[PDB]
Tab-separated table of C-alpha atoms in Angstrom:
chain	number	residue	atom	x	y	z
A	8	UNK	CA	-5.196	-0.605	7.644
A	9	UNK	CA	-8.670	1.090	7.347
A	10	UNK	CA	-11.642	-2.125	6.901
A	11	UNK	CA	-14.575	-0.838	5.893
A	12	UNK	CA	-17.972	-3.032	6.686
A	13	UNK	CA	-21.628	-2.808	6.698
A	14	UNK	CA	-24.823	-4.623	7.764
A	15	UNK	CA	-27.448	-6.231	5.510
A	16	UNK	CA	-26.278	-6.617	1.514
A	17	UNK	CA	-25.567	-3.103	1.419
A	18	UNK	CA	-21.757	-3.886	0.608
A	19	UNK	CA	-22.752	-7.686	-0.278
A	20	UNK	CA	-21.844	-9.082	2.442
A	21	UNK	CA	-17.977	-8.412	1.995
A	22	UNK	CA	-15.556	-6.071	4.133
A	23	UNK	CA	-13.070	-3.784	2.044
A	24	UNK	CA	-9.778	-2.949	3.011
A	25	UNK	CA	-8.914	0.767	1.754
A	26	UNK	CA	-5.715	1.293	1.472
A	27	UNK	CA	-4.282	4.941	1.244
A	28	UNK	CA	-6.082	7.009	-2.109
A	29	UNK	CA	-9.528	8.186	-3.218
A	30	UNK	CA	-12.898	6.289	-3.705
A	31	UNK	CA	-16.201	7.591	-4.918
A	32	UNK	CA	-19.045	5.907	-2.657
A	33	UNK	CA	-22.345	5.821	-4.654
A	34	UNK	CA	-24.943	3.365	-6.143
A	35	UNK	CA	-24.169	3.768	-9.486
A	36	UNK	CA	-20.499	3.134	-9.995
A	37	UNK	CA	-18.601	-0.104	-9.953
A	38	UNK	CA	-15.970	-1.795	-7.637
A	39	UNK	CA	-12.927	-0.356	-8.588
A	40	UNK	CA	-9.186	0.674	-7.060
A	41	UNK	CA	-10.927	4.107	-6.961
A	42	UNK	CA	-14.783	3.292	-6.632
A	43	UNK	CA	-17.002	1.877	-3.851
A	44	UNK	CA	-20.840	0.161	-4.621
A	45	UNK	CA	-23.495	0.820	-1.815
A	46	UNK	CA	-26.164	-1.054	-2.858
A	47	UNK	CA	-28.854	0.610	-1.664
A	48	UNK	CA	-31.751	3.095	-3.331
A	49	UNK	CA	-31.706	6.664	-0.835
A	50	UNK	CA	-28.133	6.963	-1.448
A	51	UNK	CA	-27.043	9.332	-4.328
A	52	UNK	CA	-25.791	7.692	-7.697
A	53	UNK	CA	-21.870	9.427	-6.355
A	54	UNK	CA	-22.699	9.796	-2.554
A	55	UNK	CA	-19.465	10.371	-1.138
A	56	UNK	CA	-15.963	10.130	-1.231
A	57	UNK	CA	-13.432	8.606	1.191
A	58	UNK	CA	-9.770	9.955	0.675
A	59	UNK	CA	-7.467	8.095	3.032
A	60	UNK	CA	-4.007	9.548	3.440
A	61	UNK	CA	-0.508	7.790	3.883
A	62	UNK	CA	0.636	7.256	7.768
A	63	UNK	CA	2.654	9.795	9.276
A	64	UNK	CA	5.796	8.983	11.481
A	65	UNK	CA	4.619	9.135	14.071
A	66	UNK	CA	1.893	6.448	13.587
A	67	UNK	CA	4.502	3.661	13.934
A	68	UNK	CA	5.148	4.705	17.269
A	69	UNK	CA	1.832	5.402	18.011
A	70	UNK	CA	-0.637	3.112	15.991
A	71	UNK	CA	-2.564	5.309	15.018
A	72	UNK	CA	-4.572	5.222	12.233
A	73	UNK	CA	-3.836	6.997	8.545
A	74	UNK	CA	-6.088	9.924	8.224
A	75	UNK	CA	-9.610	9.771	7.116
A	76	UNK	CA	-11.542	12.172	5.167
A	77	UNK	CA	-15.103	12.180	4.092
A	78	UNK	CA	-16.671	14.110	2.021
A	79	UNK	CA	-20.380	14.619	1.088
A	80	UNK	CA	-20.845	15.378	-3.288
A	81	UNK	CA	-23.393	17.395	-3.143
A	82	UNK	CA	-26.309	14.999	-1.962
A	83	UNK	CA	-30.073	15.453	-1.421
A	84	UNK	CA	-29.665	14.396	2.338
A	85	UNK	CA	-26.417	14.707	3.107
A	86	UNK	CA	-23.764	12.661	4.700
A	87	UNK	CA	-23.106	11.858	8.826
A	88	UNK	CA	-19.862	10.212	10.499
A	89	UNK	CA	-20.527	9.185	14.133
A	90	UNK	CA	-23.599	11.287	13.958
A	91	UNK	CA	-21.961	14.290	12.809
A	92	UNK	CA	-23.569	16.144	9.773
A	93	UNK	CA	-20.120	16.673	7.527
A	94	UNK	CA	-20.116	20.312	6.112
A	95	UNK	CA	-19.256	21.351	2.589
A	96	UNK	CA	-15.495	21.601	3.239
A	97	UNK	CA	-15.778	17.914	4.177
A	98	UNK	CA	-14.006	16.411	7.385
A	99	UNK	CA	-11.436	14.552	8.357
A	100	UNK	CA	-10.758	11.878	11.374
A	101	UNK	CA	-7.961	10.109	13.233
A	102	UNK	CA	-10.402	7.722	15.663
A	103	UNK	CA	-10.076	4.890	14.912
A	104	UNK	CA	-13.692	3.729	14.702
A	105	UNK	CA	-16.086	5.548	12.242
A	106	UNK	CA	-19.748	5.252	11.549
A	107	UNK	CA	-20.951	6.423	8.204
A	108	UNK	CA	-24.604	7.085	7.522
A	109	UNK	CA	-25.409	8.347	3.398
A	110	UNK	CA	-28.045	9.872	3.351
A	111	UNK	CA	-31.328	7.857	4.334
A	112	UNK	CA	-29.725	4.511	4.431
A	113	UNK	CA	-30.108	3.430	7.812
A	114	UNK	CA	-27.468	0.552	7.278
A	115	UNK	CA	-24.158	2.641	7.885
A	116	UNK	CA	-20.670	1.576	6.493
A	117	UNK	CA	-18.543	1.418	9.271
A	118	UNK	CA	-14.640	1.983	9.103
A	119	UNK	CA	-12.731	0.407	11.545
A	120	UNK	CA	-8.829	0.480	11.903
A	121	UNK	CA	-6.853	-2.810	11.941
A	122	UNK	CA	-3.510	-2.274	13.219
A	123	UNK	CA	-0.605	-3.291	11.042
A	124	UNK	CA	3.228	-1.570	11.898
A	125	UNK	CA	6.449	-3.149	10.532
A	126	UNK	CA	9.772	-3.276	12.054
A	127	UNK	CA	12.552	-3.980	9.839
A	128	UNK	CA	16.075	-5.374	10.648
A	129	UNK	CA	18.264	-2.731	8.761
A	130	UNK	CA	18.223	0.089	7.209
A	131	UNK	CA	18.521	-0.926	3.540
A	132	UNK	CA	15.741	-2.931	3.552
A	133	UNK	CA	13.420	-0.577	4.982
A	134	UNK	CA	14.740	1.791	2.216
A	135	UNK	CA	13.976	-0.803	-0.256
A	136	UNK	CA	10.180	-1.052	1.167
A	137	UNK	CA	9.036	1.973	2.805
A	138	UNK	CA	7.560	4.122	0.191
A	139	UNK	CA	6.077	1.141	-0.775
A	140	UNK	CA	4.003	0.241	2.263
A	141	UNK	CA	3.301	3.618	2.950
A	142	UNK	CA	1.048	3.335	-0.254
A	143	UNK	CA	-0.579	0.406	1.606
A	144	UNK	CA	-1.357	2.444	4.642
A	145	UNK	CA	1.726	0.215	6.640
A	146	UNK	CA	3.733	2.418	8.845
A	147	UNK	CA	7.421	1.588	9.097
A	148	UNK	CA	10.698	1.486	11.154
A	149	UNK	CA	13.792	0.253	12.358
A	150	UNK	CA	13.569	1.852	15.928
A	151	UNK	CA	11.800	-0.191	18.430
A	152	UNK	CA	7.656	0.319	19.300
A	153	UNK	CA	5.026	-0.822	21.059
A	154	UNK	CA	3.120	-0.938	18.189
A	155	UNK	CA	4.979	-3.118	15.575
A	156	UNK	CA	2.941	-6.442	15.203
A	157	UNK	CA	5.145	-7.594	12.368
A	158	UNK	CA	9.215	-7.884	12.227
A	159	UNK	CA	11.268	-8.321	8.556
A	160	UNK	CA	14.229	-9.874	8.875
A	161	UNK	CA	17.041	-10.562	6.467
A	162	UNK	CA	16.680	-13.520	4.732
A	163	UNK	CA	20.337	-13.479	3.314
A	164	UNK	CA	19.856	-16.918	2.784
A	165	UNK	CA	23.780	-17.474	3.816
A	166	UNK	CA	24.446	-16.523	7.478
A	167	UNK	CA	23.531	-16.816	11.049
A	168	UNK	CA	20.296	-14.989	11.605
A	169	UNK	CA	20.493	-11.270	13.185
A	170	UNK	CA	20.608	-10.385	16.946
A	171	UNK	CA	17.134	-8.275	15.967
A	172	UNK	CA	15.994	-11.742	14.029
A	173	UNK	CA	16.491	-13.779	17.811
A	174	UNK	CA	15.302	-11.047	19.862
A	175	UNK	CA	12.021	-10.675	17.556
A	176	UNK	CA	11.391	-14.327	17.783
A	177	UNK	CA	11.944	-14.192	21.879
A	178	UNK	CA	9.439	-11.265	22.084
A	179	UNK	CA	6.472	-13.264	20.322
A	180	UNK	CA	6.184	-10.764	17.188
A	181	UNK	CA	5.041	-12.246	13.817
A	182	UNK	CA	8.057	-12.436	11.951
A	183	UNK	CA	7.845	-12.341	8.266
A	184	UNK	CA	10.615	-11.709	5.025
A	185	UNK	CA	10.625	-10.561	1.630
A	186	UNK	CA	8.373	-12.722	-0.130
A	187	UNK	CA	5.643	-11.514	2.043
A	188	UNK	CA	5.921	-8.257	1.320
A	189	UNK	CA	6.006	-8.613	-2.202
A	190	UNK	CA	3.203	-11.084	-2.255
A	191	UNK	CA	1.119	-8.093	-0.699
A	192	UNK	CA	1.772	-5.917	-3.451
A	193	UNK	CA	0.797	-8.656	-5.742
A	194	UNK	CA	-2.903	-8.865	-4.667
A	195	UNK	CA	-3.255	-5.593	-3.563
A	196	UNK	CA	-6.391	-4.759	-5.601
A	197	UNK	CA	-7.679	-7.872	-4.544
A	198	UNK	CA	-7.717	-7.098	-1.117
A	199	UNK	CA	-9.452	-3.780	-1.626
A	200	UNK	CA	-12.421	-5.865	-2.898
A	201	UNK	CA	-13.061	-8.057	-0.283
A	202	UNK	CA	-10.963	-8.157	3.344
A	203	UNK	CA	-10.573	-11.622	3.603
A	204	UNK	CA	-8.213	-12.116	1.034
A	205	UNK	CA	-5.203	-9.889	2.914
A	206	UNK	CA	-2.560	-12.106	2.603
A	207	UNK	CA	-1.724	-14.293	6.179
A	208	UNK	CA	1.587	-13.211	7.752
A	209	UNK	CA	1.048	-16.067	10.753
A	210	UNK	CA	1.347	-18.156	7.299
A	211	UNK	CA	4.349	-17.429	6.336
A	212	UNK	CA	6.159	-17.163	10.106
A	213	UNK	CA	5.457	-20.685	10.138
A	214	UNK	CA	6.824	-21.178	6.799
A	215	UNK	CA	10.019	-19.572	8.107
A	216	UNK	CA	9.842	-21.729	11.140
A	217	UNK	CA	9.462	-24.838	9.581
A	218	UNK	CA	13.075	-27.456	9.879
A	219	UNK	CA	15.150	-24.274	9.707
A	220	UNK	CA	17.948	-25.113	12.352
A	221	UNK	CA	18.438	-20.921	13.210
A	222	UNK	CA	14.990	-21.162	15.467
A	223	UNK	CA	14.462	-22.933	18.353
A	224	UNK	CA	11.651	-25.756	18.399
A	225	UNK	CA	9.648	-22.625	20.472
A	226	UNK	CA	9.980	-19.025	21.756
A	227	UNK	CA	8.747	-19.972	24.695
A	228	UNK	CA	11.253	-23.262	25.602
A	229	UNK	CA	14.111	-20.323	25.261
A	230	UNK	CA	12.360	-17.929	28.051
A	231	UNK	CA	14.085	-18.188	31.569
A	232	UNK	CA	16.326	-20.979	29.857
A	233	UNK	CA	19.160	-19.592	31.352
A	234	UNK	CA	18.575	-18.196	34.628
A	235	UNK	CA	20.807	-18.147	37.726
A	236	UNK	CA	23.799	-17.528	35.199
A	237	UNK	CA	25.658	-14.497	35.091
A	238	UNK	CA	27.892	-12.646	31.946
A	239	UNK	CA	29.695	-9.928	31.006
A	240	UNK	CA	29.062	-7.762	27.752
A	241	UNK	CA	30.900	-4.906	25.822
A	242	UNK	CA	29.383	-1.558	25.449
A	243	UNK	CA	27.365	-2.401	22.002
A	244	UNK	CA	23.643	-3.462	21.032
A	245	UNK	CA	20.484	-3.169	23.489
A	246	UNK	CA	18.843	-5.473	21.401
A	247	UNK	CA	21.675	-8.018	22.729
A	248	UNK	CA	21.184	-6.444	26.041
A	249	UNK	CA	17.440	-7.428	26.017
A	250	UNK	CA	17.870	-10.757	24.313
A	251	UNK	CA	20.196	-11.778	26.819
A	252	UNK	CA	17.713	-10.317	29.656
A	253	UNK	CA	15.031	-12.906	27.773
A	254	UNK	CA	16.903	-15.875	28.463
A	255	UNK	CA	17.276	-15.292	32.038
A	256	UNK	CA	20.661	-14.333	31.994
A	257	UNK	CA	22.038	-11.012	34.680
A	258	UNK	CA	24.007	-8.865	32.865
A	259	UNK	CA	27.485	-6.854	33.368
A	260	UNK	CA	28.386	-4.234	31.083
A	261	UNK	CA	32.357	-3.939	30.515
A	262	UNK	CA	33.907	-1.245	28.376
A	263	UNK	CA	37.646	-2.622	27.492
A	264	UNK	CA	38.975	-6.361	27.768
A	265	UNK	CA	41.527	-4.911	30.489
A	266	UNK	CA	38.172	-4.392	32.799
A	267	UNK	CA	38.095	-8.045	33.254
A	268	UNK	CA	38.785	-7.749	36.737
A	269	UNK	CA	39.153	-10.869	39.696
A	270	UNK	CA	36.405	-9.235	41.127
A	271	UNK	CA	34.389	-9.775	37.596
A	272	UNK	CA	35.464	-13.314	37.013
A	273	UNK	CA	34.352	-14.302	40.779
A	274	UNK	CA	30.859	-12.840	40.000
A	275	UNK	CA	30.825	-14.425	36.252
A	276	UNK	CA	30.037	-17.402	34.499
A	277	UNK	CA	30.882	-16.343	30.817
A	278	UNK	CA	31.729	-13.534	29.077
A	279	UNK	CA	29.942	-12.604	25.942
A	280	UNK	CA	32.455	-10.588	23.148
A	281	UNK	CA	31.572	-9.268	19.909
A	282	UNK	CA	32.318	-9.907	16.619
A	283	UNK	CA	34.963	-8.366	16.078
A	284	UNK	CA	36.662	-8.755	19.814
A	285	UNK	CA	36.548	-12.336	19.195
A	286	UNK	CA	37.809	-12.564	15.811
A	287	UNK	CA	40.778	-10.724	16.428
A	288	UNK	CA	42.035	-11.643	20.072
A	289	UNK	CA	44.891	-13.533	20.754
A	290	UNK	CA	47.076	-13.004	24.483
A	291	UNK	CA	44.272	-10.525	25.523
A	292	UNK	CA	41.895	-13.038	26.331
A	293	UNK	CA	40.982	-13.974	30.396
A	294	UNK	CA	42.527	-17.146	30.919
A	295	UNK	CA	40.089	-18.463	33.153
A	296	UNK	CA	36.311	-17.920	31.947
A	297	UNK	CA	34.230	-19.085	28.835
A	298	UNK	CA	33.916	-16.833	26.238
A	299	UNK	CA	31.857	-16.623	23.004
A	300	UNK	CA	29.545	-14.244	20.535
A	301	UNK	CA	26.226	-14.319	20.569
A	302	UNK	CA	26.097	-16.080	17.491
A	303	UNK	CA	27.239	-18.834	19.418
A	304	UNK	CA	25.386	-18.404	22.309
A	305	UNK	CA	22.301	-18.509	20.319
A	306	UNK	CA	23.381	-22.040	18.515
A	307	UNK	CA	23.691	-23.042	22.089
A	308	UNK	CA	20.131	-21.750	23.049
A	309	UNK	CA	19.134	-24.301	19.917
A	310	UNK	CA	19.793	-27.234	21.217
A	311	UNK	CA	17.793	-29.351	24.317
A	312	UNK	CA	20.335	-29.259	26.801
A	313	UNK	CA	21.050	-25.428	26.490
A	314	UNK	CA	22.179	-24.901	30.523
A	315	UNK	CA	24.314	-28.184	30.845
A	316	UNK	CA	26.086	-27.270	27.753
A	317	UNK	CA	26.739	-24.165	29.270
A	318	UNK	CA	27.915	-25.792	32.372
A	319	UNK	CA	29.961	-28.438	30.959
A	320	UNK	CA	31.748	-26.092	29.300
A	321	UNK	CA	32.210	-24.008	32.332
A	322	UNK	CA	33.765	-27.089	33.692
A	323	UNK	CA	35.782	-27.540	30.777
A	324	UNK	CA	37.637	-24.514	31.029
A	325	UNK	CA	37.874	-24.171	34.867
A	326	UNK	CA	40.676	-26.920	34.517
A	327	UNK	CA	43.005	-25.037	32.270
């Protein structure tokens, strides 16, 4: 998101976030969704305008900022960004730091970007939401990047929550839902008025947080939790892969249940099945070895006493 900010009472004080769209910058026009008051005498009545233009894909893989263009109307002394006159065509910028001096005014407004990417934890939603926040300057995606700082997941309100959901949570991100995203839309204009009124997502991660038995007391109690164990996995989900990695856990990857050899059992502890492998399963199963989804393994993770639990039931089954 593009902040905009100046020194002295030249923007009273007050940082503006500019979302994606078109504002005249001048001393004669009034705070608008489209308008931007300088106050300030030696800058022109309409100054300038700043279009700012919707992310590209790239930029959630990237983090870089939505394009920037500046334009001088016409003025008696002209317009600079980062000391560079701007010609009659106007110009455009992808830094991610911008001085702007109008004219005279020695106080410049300076544009800074402020990096916001969202993840999202399927497909549907992001359908429902991307066209959306790429009106708000958010870049979007379901793929993973180094620069998401926020993760949606589904609030279904009626299941387990998603292997995405756990391995979010694991990797420190902000995680946020529905509500949030709406509630952005909802002050919007708001927010292009004064900064400091962008809704807080850290406020409603701990909402989320708060006595919901799907998350652990802490991230950070879960990390390492399980090392010195061992399991097998079938063929599906990275994001399982690298959740499991998280908790400590060394990993085998196994392609059919008939690859369950002595050899795999010896070097072992549990074996980790999917949904549908586990469902279904009857004679098939290894009679030896604990097995369970990651569902389950995550309700184990839950609880205080996540590796004896593990181990007691490792003993459990070693009888049988």
């Amino acid at each position: 998101m593009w902040i905009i900010e100046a020194e002295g009472d030249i923007l009273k004080g007050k940082s503006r976030i500019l979302f994606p769209g078109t504002y005249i910058v001048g001393r004669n026009v009034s705070d608008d969704s489209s308008h931007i008051q300088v106050i300030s005498k030696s800058i022109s009545k309409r100054h300038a305008r700043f279009t700012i233009l919707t992310p590209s894909e790239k930029d959630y893989f990237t983090g870089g900022p939505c394009e920037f263009e500046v334009k001088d109307l016409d003025t008696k002394f002209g317009t600079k960004v980062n000391e560079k006159v701007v010609g009659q065509n106007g110009d455009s910028y992808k830094e991610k730091d911008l001085k702007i001096q109008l004219g005279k005014c020695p106080f410049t407004i300076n544009a800074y970007w402020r990096s916001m990417c969202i993840q999202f934890d399927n497909p549907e939603m992001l359908s429902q939401w991307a066209s959306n926040l790429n009106l708000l300057g958010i870049p979007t995606g379901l793929r993973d990047s180094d620069a998401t700082t926020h993760f949606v997941m589904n609030r279904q309100a009626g299941s387990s929550i998603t292997v995405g959901t756990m391995y979010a949570f694991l990797k420190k991100t902000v995680i946020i839902d529905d509500s949030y995203l709406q509630y952005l839309s909802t002050v919007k204009e708001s927010v292009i008025e004064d900064a400091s009124l962008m809704p807080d997502a850290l406020e409603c991660f701990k909402n989320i947080i708060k006595n919901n038995d799907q998350f652990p007391s802490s991230p950070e109690d879960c990390i390492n939790s399980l090392e010195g164990f061992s399991c097998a996995m079938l063929n599906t989900s990275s994001e399982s892969h690298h959740l499991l990695e998280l908790l400590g856990l060394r990993i085998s990857t196994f392609m059919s249940l008939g690859d369950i050899d002595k050899e795999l059992i010896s070097k072992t502890d549990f074996v980790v099945l999917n949904n549908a492998v586990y469902d279904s399963e009857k004679i098939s199963f290894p009679e030896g070895i604990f097995c369970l989804t990651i569902e389950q393994l995550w309700k184990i993770i839950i609880e205080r006493n996540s590796r004896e639990l593990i181990s007691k039931e490792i003993e459990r089954l070693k009888y049988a």
